Structure 1
Amino acid sequence: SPYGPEARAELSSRLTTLRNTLAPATNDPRYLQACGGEKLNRFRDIQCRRQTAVRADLNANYIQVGNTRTIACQYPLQSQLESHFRMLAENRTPVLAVLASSSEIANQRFGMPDYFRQSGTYGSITVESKMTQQVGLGDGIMADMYTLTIREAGQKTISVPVVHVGNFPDQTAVSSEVTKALASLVDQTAETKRNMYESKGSSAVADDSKLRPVIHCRAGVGRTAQLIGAMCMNDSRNSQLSVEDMVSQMRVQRNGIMVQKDEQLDVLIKLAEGQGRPLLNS
């Protein structure tokens, strides 16, 4: 009954209502609007909540699901790379999880710059990419890891661990088992990096806006939301946080499309069921 079809339908009903409420109006005061004439949103209908926006020129949001703090964003546009790197550096990013596949990135029609597997200079910022380990996630899904060293005059140099799911499907959802494996890897990688900063007495530890895992796929609403849901379920502080809570929180803090597909929600529901976590709020 708590995970039966009627509970699942009720969850869907509540979430659909929320999506409708959060649909952007023309020049919606709730959503970030482009300044300067440059394209801001990769997709016109996938907008960035203004009050939680990380930077004025990025489609990117601070999200807190229960106690779990992250940043969710779109795959940055070519024009946005300098700002994106500055975000990554200023956040002292403990892990960047990229859920867009190599196939997607390679499709030049999609405008997804290969910004983390190659080195480059973007305005004032110089970035060096290095290959690190590779970790299997199940079902032949592979996480390729990198470190990005971000250098800029006047700024401290920051190295960001990257977890790239190079063969993450976009046509089908990955299983709860793959999702769990990915959440554990991303969490573990963030933990190691955050520990390093703690050991150096970094001032970023005291700052709520910093040390956030950064997660993006192509749009930052499907695969991204599925991962963030799994990560929040991995957080021992989040007992009794329901699936309704986690999805509504993602939606209010980014846009109404978070967890876009029923296929993705099914994964979150299965993970919740495995923990005996509630789907709905009383």
Structure 2
Amino acid sequence: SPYGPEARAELSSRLTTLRNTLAPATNDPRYLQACGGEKLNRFRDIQCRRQTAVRADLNANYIQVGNTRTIACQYPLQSQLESHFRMLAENRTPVLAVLASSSEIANQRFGMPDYFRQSGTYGSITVESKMTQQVGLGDGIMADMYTLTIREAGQKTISVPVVHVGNWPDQTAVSSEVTKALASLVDQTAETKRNMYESKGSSAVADDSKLRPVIHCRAGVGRTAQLIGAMCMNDSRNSQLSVEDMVSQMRVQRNGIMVQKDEQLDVLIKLAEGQGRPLLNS
């Protein structure tokens, strides 16, 4: 069997050798180094691939798994909020999915600014947060939606759709059913906002580095990785793309931690099996 135990074990082995190789060495050339004093990486061990770094002062990365293009990042630190909102605005973000739990945001010990649930003023950028719908994704998992309006003198006003999953505990994997429902919601939201931009002849439509869904939460390598993995499998353009490829790609494009937990890898494995998608490369 292609999804049997022998196959799973072999997948883990390759991915594990990959994780170990990608581990960040001190001043590693492959990873973005902190500009000069102010913290860059929320977690010293969880770095940002330099060749795909979106901004010099953010732990964020452009990620292309197959034909699916997104952006994965850590929860912006307090001091990176302005830069963070700029990335959001310039990317004409079709959708921002935040998989960090409400508990986490509330815990001031974690330094995770409640930047999307309330209005705020960071630098010369002023943000307007507005509540919209709320959607249950199954298993008691809830999607709280907002619209972030990025305003900045001299700059074009950009509104961003936000999908906030407030009860997906860190380092855990929700069911394949929920993950599937989530990707559908995120892909959907991104699709509607993109249509608006397309309908207005926005130039950002042709640029591949723009209009990318931004997914994250605390570190941007677990719940984030799982969602992005489920999102590429949702795109028909990725026929045959292996699970090995998917993770291999997320890791090389951000860090070797992408798809942090085994149960999170299982979910992608379950989904891929449901599509007859291969696990290993031949």
TM range (shorter): over 0.9
- Asked if 1 retains the 8 angstrom alpha-carbon contact of 2:128 and 2:149, the reply is yes
Task: Tell me if the contact between 2:251 and 2:258 (Cα under 8 Å) persists in the aligned partners.
Answer: yes
Q: Whole-Å Cα distance in 2 between the matches of residues 162 and 156 of structure 1? A: 19
Q: Give the TM-score, by structure 1 length.
A: 0.99
Question: Which range is displaced more, 40-49 or 164-173?
Answer: 164-173
Runs of at least 4 residues of structure 1 off by over 2 A?
none
2:265 maps to what in 1?
265
1:171 Cα deviation (Å)? 5.3
Superimposed CA distance per residue, residues 164-220 of structure 1 (whole angstroms, 9 cap, x where no aligned partner): 001112253211001000000000000000000001000001111100000001000
Distance in 2 between residues matched to 1:168 and 1:179, nearest whole Å: 11
Quick one: distance in 2 between partners of 1:190 and 1:273? 26
- Checking the alignment, whether the CA contact within 8 Å between 2:172 and 2:264 is kept in structure 1 is no
SS in 2 for 1:237: helix
**Superimposed CA distance per residue, residues 230-271 of structure 1 (whole angstroms, 9 cap, x where no aligned partner):** 000000100000000000000000000000110100000000
Greater CA drift, 168-177 or 179-188? 168-177
Q: Retained in 1: the 8 A contact 2:98–2:164? A: yes
Percent identity over paired residues: 100
- Secondary structure of residue in 2 paired with 1:51: helix
The structural deviation recorded for 1:36 is 2.9
8 A contact 2:217–2:223 mirrored in 1 = yes
Structure 2 distance, partners of 1:30, 1:264, is 25
Q: Kindly provide the CA deviation profile for residues 97-154 of structure 1, in whole angstroms up to 9, marking residues without a partner as x.
A: 0000101100111110000000011000000000000111001111000000000012
Q: Distance in 2 between matches of 1:184 and 1:74?
A: 22
Please say if residues 171 and 260 of structure 2, whose CA atoms lie closer than 8 Å, have aligned partners that are also in contact: no
Contact 2:96–2:161 at 8 Å: present in 1 too? yes
Where do 5+ consecutive residues of structure 1 fail to align? none
Q: Deviations over 1:57-97 (max 9, x none)?
A: 00000000000000000000000000000000000000000
SS of residue paired to 2:241: coil
Q: 2:238 is paired with a residue of what secondary structure?
A: coil
Asked whether the equivalents of residues 171 and 222 of structure 2 are also in contact (C-alpha less than 8 Å), the reply is: no
- Which stretch shifts more, 31-40 or 162-171? 162-171
Question: Following the alignment from structure 1 to structure 2, what is the Cα–Cα distance between the partners of residues 154 and 11?
Answer: 50
What is the CA–CA distance in structure 2 between the aligned matches of 1:106 and 1:59, rounded to whole Å?
A: 22
Inter-CA distance 171–14: structure 2 relative to 1 (3 Å threshold): closer
Match of 2:50 in 1: 50
* Contact 2:244 2:279 (C-alpha < 8 Å) held by counterparts: yes
- Please give the per-residue CA displacement for 1:16-40, whole angstroms capped at 9, x wherever unaligned: 1111111111111110000131100
Partners of 2:27 and 2:280 lie apart in 1 by 33
* Structure 2 segments unaligned to the other structure (5+ residues): none
Please tell me whether the aligned partners of residues 172 and 223 of structure 2 are also in contact (alpha carbons under 8 angstroms).
no
SS of the equivalent of 2:27 reads: coil
